[PDB]
């Protein structure tokens, strides 16, 4: 009856996990179990982890092994986690994520400072490069003030779980490499609200990403 390995990634060691998955992106590693050049990975990982708030400073071969195994365990455990049964979830991100998603950077660059709303329809399937937390309610304070908001449509058989450290506060989490289909990007001028519903969505999002969470 072990606690979910997911807790290890969500707590105070988050910067180590976050920086590890960032390193996987930066080095184009296909899978966390298939890291051929340990030394180069560790070096990059350490660089990223020193810039986190709070700083991930104890990066080493031991910490490498710990993080890799934990990621492994999270995926091994995944089917045993409580599936979330909501139809939709929401996420707030800062503009930093434009650095991970070139389609988003482009759309932001083209849209920025326009006086009217703009949508761009998409059909792009991606594998998510993080373990991604999402909220049931877009009003949560950690979502509502962010520049970018995702609006997730959960398809039956999706991989979102109500499990871990903030499950009792409405957090639904998705696994590393979770499949999603980007269907729409929207731009919202200052003062404008998603779906023109300020009371639900506020006025702080400039960009909305609509996406579908696909079966596991
Ligand atoms: Br992550
Ligand atoms: Cl971090
Ligand atoms: Cl940071
Ligand atoms: Cl951070
Ligand atoms: Cl595309
Ligand atoms: Cl709430
Ligand atoms: Cl929530
Ligand atoms: Cl909630
Ligand atoms: Cl809605
Ligand atoms: Cl609405
Ligand atoms: Pt960070
Ligand atoms: Pt090593
Ligand atoms: Pt696109
Ligand atoms: Pt909530
Ligand atoms: Pt909250
Ligand atoms: Pt709506």
């Amino acid at each position: 009856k072990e606690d979910p390995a997911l807790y290890k990634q969500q707590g105070g060691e988050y910067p180590y996990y976050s920086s590890f998955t960032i390193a996987l992106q930066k080095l184009n590693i296909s899978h966390y179990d298939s890291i051929i050049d340990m030394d180069n990975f560790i070096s990059k990982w350490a660089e990223i982890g020193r810039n986190m708030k709070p700083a991930a400073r104890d990066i080493s071969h031991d910490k490498f092994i710990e993080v890799q195994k934990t990621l492994g365990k999270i995926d091994a455990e995944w089917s045993g986690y409580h599936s979330a049964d909501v139809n939709e979830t929401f996420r707030g991100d800062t503009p930093v994520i434009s650095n991970s998603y070139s389609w988003l950077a482009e759309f932001i660059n083209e849209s920025e400072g326009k006086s009217d709303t703009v949508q761009k329809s998409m059909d792009l399937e991606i594998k998510s490069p993080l373990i991604m937390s999402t909220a049931k309610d877009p009003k949560m304070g950690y979502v509502s003030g962010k520049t970018i908001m995702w609006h997730f449509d959960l398809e039956p058989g999706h991989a979102g779980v109500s499990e871990g450290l903030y499950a009792s506060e409405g957090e639904v989490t998705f696994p590393l490499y979770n499949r999603m289909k980007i269907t729409s990007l929207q731009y919202l001028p200052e003062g404008r609200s998603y779906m023109d519903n300020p009371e639900q969505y506020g006025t702080s999002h400039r960009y909305i990403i609509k996406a579908r969470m696909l079966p596991r």
Side-chain angles (χ1 to χ4, degrees), residues 2-7 9-52 54-56 59-68 70-198 200-215:
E2 306 292 314
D3 287 344
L6 187 56
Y7 282 111
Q9 185 268 350
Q10 291 169 314
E13 299 216 285
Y14 173 77
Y16 286 91
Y17 285 82
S18 186
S19 69
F20 188 102
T21 61
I22 291 171
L24 295 173
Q25 300 178 240
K26 290 337 176 62
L27 293 173
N28 305 122
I29 304 294
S30 51
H31 194 277
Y32 59 82
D33 280 333
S34 78
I35 299 167
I36 304 309
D37 192 351
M38 220 166 295
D39 319 285
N40 195 44
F41 182 86
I42 288 158
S43 178
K44 186 52 133 193
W45 182 25
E47 176 185 320
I48 298 152
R50 281 193 296 270
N51 296 323
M52 303 284 82
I59 279 169
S60 66
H61 152 88
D62 295 336
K63 198 70 176 184
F64 175 84
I65 296 296
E66 181 198 337
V67 170
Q68 185 184 56
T70 290
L71 292 169
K73 300 219 296 301
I74 289 168
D75 279 329
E77 297 178 356
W78 200 268
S79 82
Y81 294 167
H82 293 90
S83 288
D85 56 4
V86 290
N87 291 329
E88 58 182 8
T89 65
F90 307 89
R91 180 174 169 91
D93 273 311
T94 76
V96 178
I97 71 162
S98 59
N99 308 339
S100 297
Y101 300 119
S102 64
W103 43 271
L104 180 62
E106 176 82 296
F107 179 80
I108 290 174
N109 289 334
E110 301 165 6
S111 289
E112 243 168 6
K114 284 197 184 166
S115 322
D116 317 3
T117 59
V118 175
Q119 302 183 15
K120 176 186 186 173
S121 187
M122 308 269 278
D123 204 71
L124 174 68
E125 177 169 323
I126 67 158
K127 290 183 185 319
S128 170
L130 67 161
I131 294 169
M132 184 184 270
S133 61
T134 75
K136 288 170 188 189
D137 189 337
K139 294 187 297 309
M140 290 309 261
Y142 60 85
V143 175
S144 67
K146 300 276 189 294
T147 304
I148 299 164
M149 188 190 82
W150 309 71
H151 180 189
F152 290 120
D153 176 16
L154 273 42
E155 288 188 351
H158 65 80
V161 300
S162 179
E163 198 71 62
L165 181 56
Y166 301 111
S168 69
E169 328 213 299
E171 178 160 288
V172 172
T173 314
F174 292 78
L176 188 56
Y177 322 130
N178 179 60
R179 289 181 340 111
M180 67 175 61
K181 180 188 169 82
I182 309 306
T183 65
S184 188
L185 309 174
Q186 306 179 207
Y187 164 70
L188 290 171
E190 288 292 342
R192 298 299 302 280
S193 306
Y194 184 42
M195 302 231 73
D196 304 307
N197 187 343
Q200 191 57 1
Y201 291 116
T203 61
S204 313
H205 313 314
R206 309 280 66 82
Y207 298 93
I208 312 295
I209 308 169
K210 298 193 71 191
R212 311 177 58 72
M213 300 298 220
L214 306 178

